[PDB]
Write a protein that binds this ligand. Structure first.
Ligand SMILES: Nc1ncnc2c1ncn2[C@@H]1O[C@H](COP(=O)(O)OP(=O)(O)O)[C@@H](O)[C@H]1O
Ligand code: VO4
Ligand SMILES: [Mg+2]
Length: 338
């Protein structure tokens, strides 16, 4: 498939604990139902996706959907496509606190590594098994945040907030002066995003709370070079893993505490991405897009191409108090494919 969509509900969080929240999410197979806390006497509204991940309990539960599961379904498939020579893209979408970061990066602790860590590990693991002595590989990485059309290099503490995206007359869009580092091992790449991840939540990020109102993009350019007598062949694929800004922040009217240039940019970004993805889906059903409408869809143009593969995971809170924005996330994920 050219587009894949999954939704994932998490355990109650602290806010939901204090409010004595009831669970309004249910799942069976690839289907998720959502109840209206006001009309609990109703028939839940249903939605179907490629995957409906029930992660509301804990790994102690036999039917808890774990980080390894989510990854073997979505991540593994994408990395395989990447070895074929094609670009891929994984997006985590949802309201602030729903589970986007946990799904993408997760926790360094045993058992909770997100999709990025597992994908990087799987990548070097497959690479190190290459017995063919006529095989050469290169892995370059970039880690950045997109805030109000401005890019912050997460891999370099001495040039942030200011980077701007450009468009090469022939090569495509690119961030000027963005660090792109060649890594030769997993322990190495594991340091870069550990380093990039802390940059995401240092005390200073709470000024504009860029942790939840910016898009975090982890890019990996994977080059494969084959040797045969004589020409050497080269396959280069781009992999973009993204932790989108919060969906409830898509408001550009002042609610609630979110600034105009902030939500405007976020609404525009999530809306455009929605058009691009559904557009890619209508396309793959039968068997040019407004990427310029947002810095995010513009920078990732080549990953949302024609032979590109994309997957999205929409994170969902299970709480009654988040019905509105959770319904809103189901619809958004629903439109992306349907
Ligand atoms: N599947 C899950 N398993 C365990 N904890 C999760 C899960 N999904 C979300 N959470 C918890 O909810 C919190 C908020 O989501 P996390 O991804 O930070 O941020 P956001 O959803 O805003 O990107 C974290 O403290 C995390 O531990
Ligand atoms: O992060 V604010 O200045 O919106 O409080
Ligand atoms: Mg987050």
């Amino acid at each position: 498939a050219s587009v894949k969509v999954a939704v994932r509900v998490r355990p109650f969080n602290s806010r939901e604990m204090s409010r004595d929240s009831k669970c309004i999410i249910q799942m069976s197979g690839s289907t998720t139902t959502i109840v209206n806390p006001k009309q609990p006497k109703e028939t839940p509204k249903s939605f179907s996706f490629d995957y409906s991940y029930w992660s509301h309990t804990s790994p102690e539960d036999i039917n808890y959907a774990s980080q390894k599961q989510v990854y073997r379904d979505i991540g593994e498939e994408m990395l395989q496509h990447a070895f074929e020579g094609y670009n891929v893209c994984i997006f985590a979408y949802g309201q602030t606190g729903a589970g986007k970061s946990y799904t993408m990066m997760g926790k360094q602790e045993k058992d909770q590594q997100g999709i990025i860590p597992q994908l990087c590990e799987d990548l070097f693991s497959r690479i190190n098994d290459t017995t063919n002595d006529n095989m050469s590989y290169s892995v370059e990485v970039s880690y950045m945040e997109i805030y109000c059309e401005r890019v912050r290099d997460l891999l370099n503490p001495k040039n942030k907030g200011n980077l701007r995206v450009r468009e090469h007359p022939l090569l495509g869009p690119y961030v000027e002066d963005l660090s792109k580092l060649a890594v030769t091992s997993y322990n190495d790449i594991q340091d870069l995003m550990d380093s990039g991840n802390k940059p995401r939540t240092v005390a200073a990020t709470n000024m504009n709370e860029t942790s939840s109102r910016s898009h975090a993009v982890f890019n990996i350019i994977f080059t494969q070079k084959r040797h045969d007598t004589n020409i050497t062949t080269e396959k280069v694929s781009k992999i973009s893993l993204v932790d989108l800004a919060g969906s409830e922040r898509a408001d550009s009217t002042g609610a609630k505490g979110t600034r105009l240039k902030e939500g405007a940019n976020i609404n525009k970004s999530l809306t455009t991405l929605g058009k691009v993805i559904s557009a890619l889906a209508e396309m793959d059903s039968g068997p040019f897009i407004p990427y310029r409408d947002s810095v995010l869809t513009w920078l990732l143009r080549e990953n949302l191409g024609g032979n590109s593969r994309t997957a999205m995971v929409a994170a969902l809170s299970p709480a009654d108090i988040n019905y509105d924005e959770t319904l809103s996330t189901l619809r958004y994920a629903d439109r992306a494919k349907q």
